[PDB]
Design an enzyme around this catalytic site. Structure first.
Site, PDB file in Angstrom:
ATOM      1  CG  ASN A  35      -3.440  -2.619  16.565  1.00 30.34           C
ATOM      2  OD1 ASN A  35      -3.984  -2.266  15.523  1.00 30.34           O
ATOM      3  ND2 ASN A  35      -4.087  -3.098  17.615  1.00 30.34           N
ATOM      4  CG  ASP A 105       2.087  -1.685  19.468  1.00 31.16           C
ATOM      5  OD1 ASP A 105       1.875  -2.089  20.632  1.00 31.16           O
ATOM      6  OD2 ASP A 105       1.320  -1.896  18.500  1.00 31.16           O
TER       7      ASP A 105
END
Ligand SMILES: [Br-]
Ligand SMILES: [Br-]
Length: 293
Positions: A35, A105
């Site tokens: 993200n 991530d």
């Protein structure tokens, strides 16, 4: 370099059309963004792996050139929902059983989970600024703590769906060099519209296994952390300085992982924008070693 790597292809998945990059032949080298990023994040790293295998970079659903989910809401784009689209995408791509994973991530939460469930097909895992384990607030990077706490509150809709804060503030804010105009256009393109098109970049921070919540994602991260700490699968840890997510206790725990090579590159969170050629060189070195002659 602001130019994308290769070109996008599309495939219909669960009636949902996802976008991806697929270049070369041979065992895949799978790069997965998180993200509020897309395949674009690897554009200057993937070139280093040319001729080393099949280079693949998928756009998470609702992200990049991938279709949005409809109807969208606060209950859309949770972890479970991304994994169900990703699993079917990775299945459709016919990757084989010698896959190298390159993760960041939520790409690492997702890749790591996938890897556990398909450990036999995993030649190697390269990770950086990852979600390695469930954490507490004290472990979260200080500068952005109360902001991430607010995303996980009713203020979350205003910050992200209305103002696009994750894309316009979080992303630049955690890259050490000035991004170019063409580079911020490519990251903002999938989220140009206010409202639900930006839902995935709000649902993602809501999904982070922090302080025991949410319990399902915590459980999955508990799961793959225990596994990774024990797996003899070759690992490349790209450490970052000063880093952001993978510092302190989580960094401590990651340094515990077996059969692991570690390098340190300049960067905060989205270190592919600060040290792409040092990261690229290391990944290509790793794969070569994993894939002799
Ligand atoms: Br910056
Ligand atoms: Br996030």
């Amino acid at each position: 370099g602001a130019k994308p790597f290769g070109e996008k292809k599309f495939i219909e998945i669960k009636g949902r059309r996802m976008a991806y990059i697929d270049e070369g032949t041979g065992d895949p080298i799978l790069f997965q963004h998180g993200n509020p990023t897309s395949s674009y994040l690897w554009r200057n790293i993937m070139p280093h792996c040319a001729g080393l295998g099949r280079l693949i970079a998928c756009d998470l659903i609702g992200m990049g050139d991938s279709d949005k989910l409809d109807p969208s809401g606060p209950e859309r784009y949770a972890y479970a929902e991304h994994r169900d689209y990703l699993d079917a995408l990775w299945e459709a791509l016919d990757l084989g059983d010698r896959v190298v994973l390159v993760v960041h991530d939520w790409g690492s939460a997702l890749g790591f989970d996938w890897a556990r469930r398909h450990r036999e097909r995993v030649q190697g895992i390269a990770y950086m600024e990852a979600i390695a384990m469930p954490i507490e607030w004290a472990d979260f990077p200080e500068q952005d703590r109360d902001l991430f706490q607010a995303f996980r509150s009713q203020a979350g809709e205003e910050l992200v769906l209305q103002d696009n804060v994750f894309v316009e503030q979080v992303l630049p804010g955690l890259i050490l060099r000035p991004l170019s105009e063409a580079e911020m256009a490519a990251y903002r393109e999938p989220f140009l519209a206010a409202g639900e098109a930006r839902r995935p970049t709000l649902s993602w921070p809501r999904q982070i296994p922090i302080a025991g919540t949410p319990a399902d994602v915590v459980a999955i991260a508990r799961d793959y952390a225990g596994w990774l700490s024990e797996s003899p699968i070759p690992k490349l840890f790209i450490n970052a300085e000063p880093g952001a997510l993978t510092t302190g206790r989580m960094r401590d725990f990651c340094r515990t992982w077996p059969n692991q090579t570690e390098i340190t590159v300049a960067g905060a969170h989205f270190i592919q924008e600060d040290s792409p050629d040092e990261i690229g060189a290391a990944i290509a070195a790793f794969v070569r070693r994993l894939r002799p002659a």
